[PDB]
Design a protein around this ligand. Structure first.
Ligand SMILES: NC(=O)C1=CN([C@@H]2O[C@H](COP(=O)(O)OP(=O)(O)OC[C@H]3O[C@@H](n4cnc5c(N)ncnc54)[C@H](OP(=O)(O)O)[C@@H]3O)[C@@H](O)[C@H]2O)C=CC1
Ligand SMILES: COc1ccccc1/C(=C/c1coc2nc(N)nc(N)c12)CC(C)C
Length: 186
């Protein structure tokens, strides 16, 4: 199994969601970036795995659900089986990562992408080992009711560029944003 990663888009006030949707209006190219980064795998005969909490799963409109071309895993202790359209269900983050090593998935999964929400991000980020964060900084404040956990910059280094990630300011619907990649190894 290849690398472990988180990917998020976050306002200046650290918001990632409001009422089960994003705090900002739809940013089509931002979403295209999320789909590209999470779907593209350099290893022949493998797909990437996306890991998400239950409320994030149900935030994806049925049209984009499961995320196509990726294996979709949902975290929940209440659910008894994967939701309609999902592929896997685990009861903890550690369980989901252990599962990638089982015979059913060990030779099928390339990268692992944690796609939210706030508790899953927090636990992924505080878990020893090699981890990258792909963070889109939406450069305005937006009313939110979720939030991204604190990024400890003593351990997460902001990389000075990264292949396949544009380094300059983007703008859609009058909202400027930029792409960042952070890496820790502890
Ligand atoms: N980049 C972005 O801007 C992103 C935005 N979002 C937004 O964030 C919001 C959803 O996030 P949030 O409210 O944080 O919720 P989550 O997606 O984290 O869902 C939480 C539910 O998931 C299950 N859960 C979470 N972590 C675990 C765990 N480690 N083990 C087992 N079960 C777990 C629990 O279910 P149970 O109670 O069944 O056990 C929990 O009640 C929405 O507004 C969505 O639009 C989401 C992702 C990215
Ligand atoms: C348009 O996206 C949404 C709309 C409504 C509810 C949830 C989302 C999602 C959010 C993001 C998770 O990591 C993300 N990372 C980045 N860089 N951008 C994102 N947008 C997400 C996931 C996809 C829908 C499946």
């Amino acid at each position: 199994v290849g690398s472990l990663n988180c990917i998020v888009a976050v306002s200046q006030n650290m918001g990632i969601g409001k009422n089960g949707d994003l705090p900002w209006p739809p940013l089509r190219n931002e979403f295209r970036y999320f789909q590209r980064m999470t779907t593209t795998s350099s290893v022949e005969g493998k797909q990437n795995l996306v890991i998400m909490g239950k409320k994030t799963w149900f935030s994806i409109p049925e049209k984009n659900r499961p995320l196509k071309g990726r294996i979709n895993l949902v975290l929940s202790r209440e659910l008894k089986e994967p939701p309609q359209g999902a592929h896997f269900l685990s009861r903890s983050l550690d369980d989901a990562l252990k599962l990638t090593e089982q015979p059913e998935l060990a030779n099928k999964v390339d990268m692992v992408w944690i796609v939210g929400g706030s508790s899953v991000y927090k636990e992924a980020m505080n878990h020893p080992g090699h981890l990258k964060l792909f963070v889109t900084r939406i450069m305005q404040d937006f009313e939110s009711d979720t939030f991204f956990p604190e990024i400890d910059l003593e351990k997460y280094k902001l990389l000075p560029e990264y292949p396949g990630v544009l380094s300059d300011v983007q703008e859609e619907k009058g909202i400027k944003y930029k792409f960042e990649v952070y890496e820790k190894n502890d």
